């Protein structure tokens, strides 16, 4: 599928509402494995299990290890652009 850019809106007290797997040390993209019901990723309607996260907020995640991707993702606030692809 095509690259999509999806805007997620989260309030400061909530999480992103995703679980992720993969990353550079696994030789596969950062991948959404869960979408948590009622949380920001669920609510925006444009993020899905199976999506690769290529970038978040202009931060390239194509070549980032899992832990660093988790950290960057967890630092995001407010209106957040996800660059994703389901290949």
């Amino acid at each position: 599928g095509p690259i999509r850019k999806v805007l997620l809106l989260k309030e400061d007290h909530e999480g992103l509402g995703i679980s992720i797997t993969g990353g550079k040390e696994h030789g596969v993209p950062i991948l959404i494995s869960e979408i948590h019901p009622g949380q920001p990723a669920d609510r925006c309607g444009g993020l899905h299990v199976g999506d690769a996260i290529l970038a978040v907020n202009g931060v390239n995640l194509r070549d980032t290890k899992h832990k660093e991707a988790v950290t960057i993702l967890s630092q995001q606030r407010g209106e957040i652009e996800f660059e994703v692809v389901y290949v």
Partner: peptide, 4 residues
């Protein structure tokens, strides 16, 4: 998986 990590939860975020």
């Amino acid at each position: 998986d990590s939860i975020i």
